[PDB]
Ligand binder design. Structure first.
Ligand SMILES: CO[C@@H]1CCN(c2nccc(Nc3cc4n(C5CCC6(CC5)OCCO6)c(C)cn4n3)n2)C[C@@H]1F
Ligand SMILES: [Cl-]
Ligand SMILES: [Cl-]
Ligand SMILES: [Cl-]
Ligand SMILES: [Cl-]
Length: 300
């Protein structure tokens, strides 16, 4: 025992236990469907996202989806997405929890006129909680960004996208720490950098970081000492935390546990820390042969 044994269970599901209802999106990875999973013998209906392979089943693609599935089967935290199982059909399918409100990036862009300070600062806490869990599990995420946080409810977000994640190419330069761009060094403290950019995406309502700058210049821009600008809604309190995440010395950046502490202090008095016009009034969502629908988080 030099590392501890990963005693996670990989569950293999029959195709007959589930049904695809609509497509939620498609890329070069394949297709995410909305479905229901109904495990045999249990009077339980579980809403799922089924990520099917690209149909072009291929040793390289099949390798990489199973690496993602390895990590997603191995995590268990309220702010991290878990895999429910695999189906080993001709195109392999990962069965995941449905996060019905989508990515947090798209959510902030769509709902900006009704997102208030309490929600933004609570999202920051939740992402810091889930990243602190990944640090405990010894996983460096390597692709933290507001695209890769999903919304179960507006009150409940989870980190996803474990397809870069590593223990202990085309790359997302504008979320990466300087050591990662220059030297390929990745650490928990380089995910802290990306957390800073992620918070910046949220507090700017989904604005693109470094918009217009070619990715070759980013490393030189950063070496010269420039960072992303203070979002309009942000007090110096919140923005100084973003700045601290973007220090050159990685050990001078905050820990995820300290981000939990700081953002949760701020979340007890939101309007002292983010200034949003109309904040006091803003009210967001809180939610069909569907008697036996249980969410995956209650199906242990
Ligand atoms: C491209 O591989 C990723 C792997 C991670 N993923 C995921 N993990 C754990 C649960 C879950 N659940 C879910 C996803 C969605 N979506 C979208 C979100 C945005 C989207 C299309 C699917 O995924 C990213 C690109 O575009 C919607 C409208 C409802 N739910 N519920 N998804 C989403 C992808 F599969
Ligand atoms: Cl692990
Ligand atoms: Cl801006
Ligand atoms: Cl200001
Ligand atoms: Cl601090």
């Amino acid at each position: 025992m030099g590392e501890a044994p990963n005693q996670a269970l990989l569950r293999i599901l029959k195709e007959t236990e589930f049904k695809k209802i609509k497509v939620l999106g498609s890329g070069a990875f394949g297709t995410v469907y909305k479905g229901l999973w109904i495990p045999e013998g249990e009077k339980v209906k579980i809403p799922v996202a089924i990520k099917e392979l690209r149909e072009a089943t291929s040793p390289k693609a099949n390798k990489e989806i199973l690496d993602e599935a390895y990590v997603m089967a191995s995590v268990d935290n309220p702010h991290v997405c878990r895999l429910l199982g695999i189906c080993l059909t001709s195109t392999v399918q990962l069965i995941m929890q449905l996060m019905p409100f989508g990515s947090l990036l798209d959510y902030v862009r769509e709902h900006k006129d009704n997102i208030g300070s309490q929600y933004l600062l609570n999202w920051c806490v939740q992402i810091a909680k889930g990243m602190n869990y990944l640090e405990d599990r010894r996983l460096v995420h390597r692709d933290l960004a507001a695209r890769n946080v999903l919304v179960k409810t507006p009150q409940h977000v989870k980190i996803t996208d474990f397809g870069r994640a590593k223990l202990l190419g085309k790359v997302p330069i504008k979320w990466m720490a300087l050591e990662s761009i220059l030297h390929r060094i990745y650490t928990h403290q380089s995910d802290v950098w990306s957390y800073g950019v992620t918070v910046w995406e949220l507090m700017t309502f989904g604005s693109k970081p470094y918009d217009g700058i070619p990715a070759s210049e980013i490393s030189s821009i950063l070496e010269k000492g420039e960072r992303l600008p203070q979002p309009p809604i942000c007090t110096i309190d919140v923005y100084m935390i973003m700045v601290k995440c973007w220090m050159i010395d990685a050990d001078s950046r905050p820990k995820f546990r300290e981000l939990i502490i700081e953002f949760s202090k701020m979340a007890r008095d939101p309007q002292r820390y983010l200034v949003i016009q109309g904040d006091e009034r803003m009210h967001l969502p809180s939610p069909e042969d569907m008697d036996d629908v249980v969410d995956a988080d209650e199906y242990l």
